[PDB]
Amino acid sequence: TTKDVIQKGISVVGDLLGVVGFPFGGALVSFYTNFLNTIWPSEDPWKAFMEQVEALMDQKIADYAKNKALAELQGLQNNVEDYVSALSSWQKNPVSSRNPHSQGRIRELFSQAESHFRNSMPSFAISGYEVLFLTTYAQAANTHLFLLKDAQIYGEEWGYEKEDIAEFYKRQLKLTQEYTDHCVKWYNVGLDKLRGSSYESWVNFNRYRREMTLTVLDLIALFPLYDVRLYPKEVKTELTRDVLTDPIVGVNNLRGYGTTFSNIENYIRKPHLFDYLHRIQFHTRFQPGYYGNDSFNYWSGNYVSTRPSIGSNDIITSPFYGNKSSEPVQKLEFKGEKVYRAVANTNLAVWPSAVYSGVTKVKFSQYNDKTKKASKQTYDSKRNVGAVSWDSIDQLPPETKKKPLKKGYSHQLNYVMCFLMQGSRGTIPVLTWTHKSVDFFNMIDSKKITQLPLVKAYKLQSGASVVAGPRFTGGDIIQCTENGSAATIYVTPDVSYSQKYRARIHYASTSQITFTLSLDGAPFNQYYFDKTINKGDTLTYNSFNLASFSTPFELSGNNLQIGVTGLSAGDKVYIDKIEFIPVN
CA distance 250 to 206: 19
What is the CB neighbour count within 10 angstroms for residue 467? Answer: 15
Strands 477-480 and 411-420: unpaired
Contact 252, 268 (CB under 8 A): no
Structure determined via: X-ray
Contact 190, 212 (CB under 8 A): yes
Instruction: Kindly tell me the sign of the dihedral angle through the C-alpha atoms of 479, 481, 483, 486.
Output: negative
Angle between helices 3-16 and 134-148 (to 10 degrees): 20
Which residues lie across from 362 on neighbouring strands?
A: 344, 379
Residue 63 is which amino acid?
Answer: D
Backbone angles phi, psi at 69, to 5 degrees: -65, -50
CA distance 245 to 219: 19
- Domain ranges for the chain: 1-229, 230-240+438-584, 241-437
**Degrees, nearest 5: CA angle 3-8-394:** 20
Three-state secondary structure call for residue 471? coil
CA distance 381 to 379: 7
Three-state secondary structure call for residue 2? coil
Q: Count of H helices and E strands in the chain?
A: 12, 27
What is each CA distance from 302 to 85, 283, 363, 542, in whole angstroms? 55, 6, 16, 43
Which residues lie across from 454 on neighbouring strands?
A: none
**Degrees, nearest 5: CA angle 373-379-380:** 125
Q: Which residues contact 284 (CB under 8 A, 6 or more apart)?
A: 297, 298, 299, 300, 325, 326, 327, 328, 329, 330, 381, 382
Contact 436, 367 (CB under 8 A): no
Contact 476, 469 (CB under 8 A): yes
Length of the chain: 584
Three-state secondary structure call for residue 414? strand
Burial class from Cβ neighbours inside 10 Å (0-12, 13-18, 19+) for residue 442 reads buried
What is each CA distance from 312 to 273, 440, 490, in whole angstroms? 12, 12, 9
Instruction: Transcribe 70-138 into DSSP letters.
Output: HHHHHHHHHHHHHHHHHHHHHHHS-TTT--HHHHHHHHHHHHHHHHHHHHHGGGGS-TT-TTTTHHHHH
How many angstroms separate the first and last alpha carbons of the chain? 49
**Degrees, nearest 5: CA angle 288-293-297:** 40
